[model samples]
Target: PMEKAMLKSAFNFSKDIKKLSKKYKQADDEFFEELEDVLIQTDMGMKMVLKVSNLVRKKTKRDTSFENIKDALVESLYQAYTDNDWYRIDFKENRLNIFMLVGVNGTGKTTSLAKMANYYAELGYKVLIAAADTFRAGATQQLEEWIKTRLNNKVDLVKANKLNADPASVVFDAIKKAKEQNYDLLLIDTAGRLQNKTNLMAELEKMNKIIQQVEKSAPHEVLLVIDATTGQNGVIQAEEFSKVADVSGIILTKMDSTSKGGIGLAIKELLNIPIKMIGVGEKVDDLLAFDIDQYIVHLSSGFMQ
Candidate 1:
């Protein structure tokens, strides 16, 4: 909910449907074809296209007006994405909360961690970040700097060899530190390596085991960060990660740069994981909770022939 206005603005490209439909209005088939192209271009995927097309056909058979068609389309889109109630985040009692952030490299995993830390801190929770991404050079330093300069939140940097460090050991140290200090939340950053799927899976499984050793249910959330611009590849990544580890939810980044906001819908339908957050811009405040209603309104607002 933090970046509601920005999220709406990201879908502004879809508001020109009236102009877009003018070219194909002469033929019903042509009109629908163009509509499908628009949806696909927006990264809505085949499943959503078929579902939305069916709804449109039904509405048109009822002799619905253009305005009515738009309303029905928005309603159908919202129903598809909002059918499940997995958006809520639950906290456990008498245990340190842990969230493991996973994603491919360059998907803004570290920055997302900073944003989450700041968001939770504002809600009166004590936040501690674990620099567990030891594979990349200066990974720990980058996370440590974010806590000091950006959020001003407390962070514990567990030092390890840049190339040979064990991700599981880093996570264990962080969890141990959190328990000793009675921290409310611990955010663990992991190395993002999707090309080596087996290595990624192994590392994540090991990290989960080490966390469970500290608290059986320590990692209350396993969040996968993805770049929306990657389109269907993002969905594939989510699918692969889900198989390796229990991915509780997703955090989509770089949505502001792409007109394909509908990728979020495809991801939800394919992975069945709730999109917990979306990054709309480069700023820390750009991250917003996923609201299906607002997303539908933004994506389906405009004229249709």
Candidate 2:
């Protein structure tokens, strides 16, 4: 299947495992210990590495063939990290579907928003973008300029510039517009400042309250966009943002640029947030639904072959 070939682009973390599997007569202490290090070095996170290692150790008792261990490696990782078909992007019936995108600066969070809008637009869904980053210079313009096609509204404090104003005011306005326009989906692009965690968290909390005013579950998903090349630092962003943003899913961007592709498994292991989509390349159509099964096969084969 295309799954194995598609994942080869990510990385071949199976290198050490391949050699160790062929050498080990059984899944003994030394084998598990070394195998754990292999997975952990890929930034898979030590806890997850241990979990996968222990599982493989048990299976080795049954049959420790070279091919068996190779397949077991993929299965152990897939089983350790998660369990779910996290591919579906749900939409409310007869209501506007809202998805707020959040991430630090330059993680391609904003760009992913545009990609997501275009992705769904091509699928025959009317998409609208809310440029809710009243925080950054030229952020509104950035979002507006990027949309080659689709409806988008900038939500910066205009009149509120002279008075006490929160960015949530812009969120309220965007919801009103999306409702009035009868758009099927509304994607909210949020601020990405992380130095001042207190302020950023407060801003997100206020925005969430404003969204509930329109529909209790309007913002169907709060997806955090993370640059896969950033390594464990992306996991740090996910952890910090999840504290105040209630991030429901993750968008791992720049998947094609990094050889260490286990960031998805790390994020899922550390924060328990499922990666909903990934940016495999630099095109508008590069975004693809994340399927962990296909991902592991590619990882295993890439490293071994």
Candidate 3:
């Protein structure tokens, strides 16, 4: 699994951990301070650093042994993820599975949608791609090209007016087509513009209304794609998106390039949203299912020691 692979890659930091632990046998103030630095360097953030440090201190105080410190740290990381139930992707059968992908530019929202389409298509489900992002020139065309070349799934590109196209109308047409054709999944791509939050929120609301007009409880999921390298700033983006729309989950992209994997944990804790998938690389198969156990192992893998 990708998570296990990530952990193995992170194990390179274990050598340093051994050196640090050897220097300080007892869990003293110096040990805790150094441990905190290690976590922060791993991009675990201050909150997670404190949480893990406190847990490690408690365990050491109770046992008076440093032999199990590594094990306790791993368990603490695992528990942090296991505490939340956000791994499952619920799809309603009666209504069309409409998922609106929203995020700022450079978050890989378009590529992520194509990957999702391929995922569903491989599962023997008919996937439909709606090029609803009419703001950018060739936005719809780009999605159509991906659908045709990459996934080979049936795609319906809602034509956009170059100067000033209505994104809501594009979404309305896509949802209507999905209902009529009984497509198993409808993945709608939205413009990745953050210049005007009010306009974007209004557009999202309008699109939501149109989808409900065709089928109630439509647009079943609002997935906010975030760049993993953004760290805490990614959490802020999720916050903004949530305020504008009902963001059900997060899709983190560029994880392989980021040393700040802890941001994923932070977003999960802050927004209480399930991380559906993580984009580890540029390949189509780079998008992997978010597994809590694997992530914890990766986070604790000594790579940042």
TM-score of each: 0.85, 0.84, 0.87
| lDDT tens digits, residue span 278-301, model 1 | 776777667777777766665554
Worst 10 residues of 3 by lDDT: 4-13
Q: Scored by CA lDDT, what does every candidate get?
A: 0.72, 0.71, 0.72
Off by over 4 Å in 2: 1-11, 83-88, 149-166, 303-305
Off by over 4 Å in 3: 1-16, 61-67, 84-87, 154-163, 302-305
Candidates sorted by lDDT, best first = 3, 1, 2
> Going through the candidates in order, what is the number of backbone clashes in each?
1, 0, 0
User: CA shift at 52, candidate 3, in angstroms?
Assistant: 1.6
**Residue pairs with backbone overlap in model 2:** none
Per-residue alpha-carbon lDDT of model 2 for 52-131, expressed as tens digits?
88878766654466677776777887887665444466665678788989887677877788788877777777777777
Model 2, residue 157: displacement in angstroms?
16
Candidate 2, position 205, lDDT: 78
RMSD of 1: 3.3
Model 3 steric clash pairs = none
> Which 10 successive residues of model 1 have the least lDDT summed?
1-10
Give the higher-lDDT candidate: 2 or 3: 3
